[PDB]
Amino acid sequence: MQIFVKTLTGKTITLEVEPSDTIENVKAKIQDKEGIPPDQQRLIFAGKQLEDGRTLSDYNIQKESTLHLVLRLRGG
């Protein structure tokens, strides 16, 4: 299952994530692929806030699905 995480700026990257795998596992891979901490970027889909402790199938996230990302400005 290779989905496409699209950010606000307009960055859609192909990221593979199992449906059972929680959002943390996704932000996890996305964190090691882009360098964005799980608690630094907020993802949204179908008007639902993807919580760190939530599954994908719950938000009807299919393959190549466009997952909205929100990069939290101001780091450290």
């Binding site: 606000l8 008007g47 909205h68 929100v70 990069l71 400005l73």
Partner: peptide, 19 residues
């Protein structure tokens, strides 16, 4: 088809500088 509608608000909402 209001997926980007509400998201568009988050774009500028996150891009703050002077206000």
């Amino acid at each position: 088809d209001t997926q980007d509608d509400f998201l568009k608000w988050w774009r500028s909402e996150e891009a703050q500088d002077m206000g």
